[PDB]
């Protein structure tokens with residue numbers, strides 16, 4: 001039941017679910033949602049809301065798609081902005097970003113809190129202090145920005161960043177990170193339109209794997 005069920009992946013870890021995989025949790029209003037738990041990385045108990053690995057899924061999508069979520073439990077997905085809001089509203093959730101390049105190097109970044117607002121406030125990013133990690137910091141520059149898609153420009157640029165740059169993000173003018181960008185497979189000649197984390201590999205290298213995930217702080 002909702003009353004006795006888990007609220008997130010940390011609750012499931014505490015109950016002795018030790019393998020990563022898809023589990024049912026209960027959101028604050030008791031709506032059930034199936035989510036990917038990362039039980040292995042950095043203590044486990046992370047709820048994963050973004051995953052890229054192979055370029056099989058098109059991420060250049062509209063507001064409605066990002067609002068409801070898209071992709072596959074078997075592979076790449078975006079969990080959905082309504083879902084991410086519900087998951088991060090109550091309490092305080094830390095954020096971890098996990099990255100792998102095409103040369104096999106693992107890199108990460110961690111933030112002390114992470115929340116997205118509701119749709120009325122355009123799923124605005126509310127980001128806490130950078131903790132550290134080998135990937136460096138490419139998200140703080142996005143704090144307090146609305147989410148934007150190609151069809152809904154909420155950025156702080158005279159341009160359309162989502163169109164520029166071929167992704168969906170809390171764009172400013174325009175970005176330091178672009179993890180929902182094109183799956184460009186390592187070095188690319190086009191500027192800043194790949195799966196880029198500029199603090200680590202810059203604006204002209206697209207990562208092999210990207211994962212974004214949250215856990216109670």
Ligand SMILES: CC(=O)N[C@@H]1[C@@H](O)[C@H](O)[C@@H](CO)O[C@H]1O
Pocket residue numbers: 173174175176192203
């Ligand atoms: C790819 C991209 O958006 N790079 C921008 C750069 O063009 C801009 O001059 C600067 C202003 O703060 O912010 C960077 O993030």
Ligand SMILES: [Ca+2]
Pocket residue numbers: 153154155156157158159160161
């Ligand atoms: Ca704009």
